[PDB]
Amino acid sequence: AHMKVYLDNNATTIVDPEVKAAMDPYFTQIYGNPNSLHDFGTECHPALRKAMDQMYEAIGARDEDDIVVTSCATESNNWVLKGVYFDLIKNGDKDHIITTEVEHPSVTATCRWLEEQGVRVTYLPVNQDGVVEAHTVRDFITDKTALVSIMWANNETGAIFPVEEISEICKEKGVLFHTDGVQAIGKIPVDVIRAGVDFMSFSAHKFHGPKGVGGLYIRNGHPLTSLLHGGEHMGGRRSGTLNVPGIVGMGKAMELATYYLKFEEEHVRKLRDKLEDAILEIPDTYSVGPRENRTPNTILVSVRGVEGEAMLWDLNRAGIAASTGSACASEDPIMVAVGADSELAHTAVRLSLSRFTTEEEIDYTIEQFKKAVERLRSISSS
Amino acid sequence: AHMKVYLDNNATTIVDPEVKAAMDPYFTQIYGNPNSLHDFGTECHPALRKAMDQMYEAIGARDEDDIVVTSCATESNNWVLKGVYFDLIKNGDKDHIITTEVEHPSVTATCRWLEEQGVRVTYLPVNQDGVVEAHTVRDFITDKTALVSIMWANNETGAIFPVEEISEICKEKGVLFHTDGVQAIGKIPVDVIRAGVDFMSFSAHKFHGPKGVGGLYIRNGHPLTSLLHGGEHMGGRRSGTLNVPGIVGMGKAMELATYYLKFEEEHVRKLRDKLEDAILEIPDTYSVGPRENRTPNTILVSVRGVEGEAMLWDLNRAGIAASTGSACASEDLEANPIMVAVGADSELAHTAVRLSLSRFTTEEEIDYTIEQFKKAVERLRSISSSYA
């Protein structure tokens, strides 16, 4: 019968009960402010130390590097972009920023505002594989380009970007490299020195951490004008009282994410493959992006004659939670990723699994997906 | 002699068990993203609506006004200051900001950075009563002042500022008014329409809410360039996925604060007065700021022979958590020695002990604190040769 099933994990994830249990004491039992000197404030210090160590270990950062705890990855992207604009463009000799058209709104709208501040930005268009290659940014760097900001993995298609090669090209030309790694943590191996990035954004509520806490990785403590001034929190890089429960839960979730990636990647990937094979068995269906360079939990299927929003609605009525993704038509016939702002864009259904997805959920989802496609095709003009 | 007693509530407060219980479901049971269309995401919508309604009712805002949920009051202060700088100074006809020497670092360091961006800032010194009067701001407002930012109540002395009259002077001269009201919620009646304020910052963990959530009140949805761009969260004014547990707990905590305000004015004030009277029984002790204009939970005591930090450490070894406050010596019109508030960056500033109670403070804690405070004063005066 009716069964509630969650497959919109790329938008947000359930908080692991272990993460919530790790967070629980730091509301009422342990509540002191960590910058105070009395025992109430210092009581949480070992927990904060352990959480920061878990984060450093989870992304492979070194001791010279910095990991600043933000409120969200949106804050991290705003901070990196506007700070490099302030440092190298308004008070520097630069005026160019390189990014892609398929970035998160926290990057796109900030860059548009920066364009309103006179900054030249080239949003690199995306290829059939749902990726931007390194030779493109390499051809697009000038002597006045301040920063290259390219997401690690896309949240609609799950396509993984070649971060190491882009970082190499950026280091040779001497321009800083920021990556939006929110879709990378918990789904692909994350080593910020092997990836060669100067800045990385990530968000806890995407790998089963709590909402309201994010992070910014900075390599070797590179100077970046603070977005929040005030006290000397986070080494004087981001003022405001520490979100102690957020930090503790974020550390626990990041450790758990690396653990379930290292031992349990086959389970999420096997179930995703099962679901995708079953869905593509329906005639005139196409999964966007090659699977061998896609995160193990993501499917983006475009159904012909049916509209993506109608499929999402009928699925939600069946208790299945999914999302949308922009795709366009092409030949080589394939459906490919495209910016949401295109006039040739249609909406495909995005299904994103997690380590909590069961095989019963996948069977129910397969049955209901077939049911919804046949039913909505029964009403289509075509 | 050890019993743990928390008297540093102006720095942060314990999360009310009811607030945590209201927050609990929105981690694992109800986790969908509110911006999604499916039932998982929309399940939390009534809770978010109720929390926002609680905030609107708690500060007396109107329906036309806006309450944008930030990550902390530091975010709200940075946002207001840098946004008015961007709107009216860099892309406007203004170049002046008026503030006080006793603001929180989130205001002061931002104003210093804006000074590094060419903005003229007047840090108004504070009067004997530890507040800034409306006629002073009136003398300092010109035709090129973009914003006046004065805290609602001070976190070191607890002195309440005459915010309504300052707002009147600002309305007469047509200048925007922002107040840092973090120390006001739960301690004094807060009506942002009676206060005539244009912006107000507040932080949940100062009134028994969770850390990681704050708020900014804006009058009539006044235009203010966003600090965080991206999606259309909070009416397109502050992007980033909503801190659903933070919002729910903040709303619950603000409702509880408005309920407990008369408790805090009656019983907590009686306990604060007990502690302060007992401390002033010690010779050569001075309470900073008049009590009749002070929040009901705060004492800032200066001791003559002893140094403040050693007193704090001795108190913490006795299990008592307190904080510091800047004070300098002066006289009253009686020509009697009194201790008065001063900015922390003054060279004539010395550290006084700040004790801040909450609705959870017991009379047992207060008796124990009285005994340990006298003990520590006697012990540190006994070791000095200069104390007379």
Short mmCIF file of C-alpha atoms in Angstrom, two decimals, chain B residues 9 21 53 62 83 97 110 131 136 139 185 199 208 275 284 288 299 304 312 378:
data_model
loop_
_atom_site.label_atom_id
_atom_site.label_comp_id
_atom_site.label_asym_id
_atom_site.label_seq_id
_atom_site.Cartn_x
_atom_site.Cartn_y
_atom_site.Cartn_z
CA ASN B 9 23.94 34.81 31.58
CA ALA B 21 11.80 19.64 23.14
CA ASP B 53 4.46 34.43 14.39
CA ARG B 62 3.66 44.63 12.50
CA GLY B 83 24.32 47.24 3.99
CA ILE B 97 27.72 56.69 11.30
CA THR B 110 32.62 46.48 11.65
CA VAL B 131 24.05 55.54 28.71
CA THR B 136 23.88 64.15 22.35
CA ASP B 139 24.17 67.30 18.45
CA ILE B 185 14.69 40.28 24.97
CA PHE B 199 16.42 47.90 12.65
CA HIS B 208 17.50 30.57 26.48
CA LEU B 275 23.26 39.68 45.83
CA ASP B 284 35.18 49.85 49.25
CA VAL B 288 28.50 50.52 38.29
CA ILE B 299 25.40 43.59 38.54
CA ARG B 304 39.25 48.38 45.32
CA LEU B 312 36.96 35.74 38.50
CA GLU B 378 39.12 39.11 51.87
#
